[PDB]
Amino acid sequence: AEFKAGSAKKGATLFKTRCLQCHTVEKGGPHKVGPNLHGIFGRHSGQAEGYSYTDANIKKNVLWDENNMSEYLTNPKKYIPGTKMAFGGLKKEKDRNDLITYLKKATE
Numbered sequence: 001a002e003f004k005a006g007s008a009k010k011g012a013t014l015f016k017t018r019c020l021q022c023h024t025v026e027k028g029g030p031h032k033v034g035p036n037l038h039g040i041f042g043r044h045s046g047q048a049e050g051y052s053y054t055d056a057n058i059k060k061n062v063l064w065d066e067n068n069m070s071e072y073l074t075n076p077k078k079y080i081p082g083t084k085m086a087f088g089g090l091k092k093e094k095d096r097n098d099l100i101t102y103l104k105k106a107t108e
């Protein structure tokens with residue numbers, strides 16, 4: 001199914017274990033391997049200030065919402081062929097819902 005609100009509490013733990021190694025969520029957080037995700041929802045892909053993306057990520061030009069984020073996070077490389085995000089995906093729909101619920105709030 002499409003996105004449905006889950007548990008931000010569980011999503012934060014998922015973020016810590018699966019994402020935090022490469023990403024920050026806070027405005028002005030440290031620079032990492034992946035782009036700062038502050039403000040990601042409602043922004044097009046490839047637009048974080050001062051980050052060097054693949055051409056693939058820029059050219060996809062997806063306007064990130066909670067539904068296409070769930071599709072992307074299922075399998076990043078299938079959604080954006082050639083992306084340099086070294087992440088196979090979140091297989092479980094419940095995990096995607098929980099993570100995205102946390103991410104939507106934490107990146108405000």
Ligand code: HEC
Nearest residue numbers: 018019022033034045046047053054057083084085086087
């Ligand atoms: C490093 C080992 C990473 C892990 C673990 C995760 N991400 Fe990532 N992400 C990473 C890179 C290097 C990039 C840039 C990709 C490119 O081709 O240029 C990304 C990109 C994203 C994006 C897109 C951001 C945009 O502005 O378009 C998102 C939304 C994203 N990453 C989210 C994300 C989440 C939620 C993770 C855990 C589940 C995660 N990433 C892991 C590097 C790495």
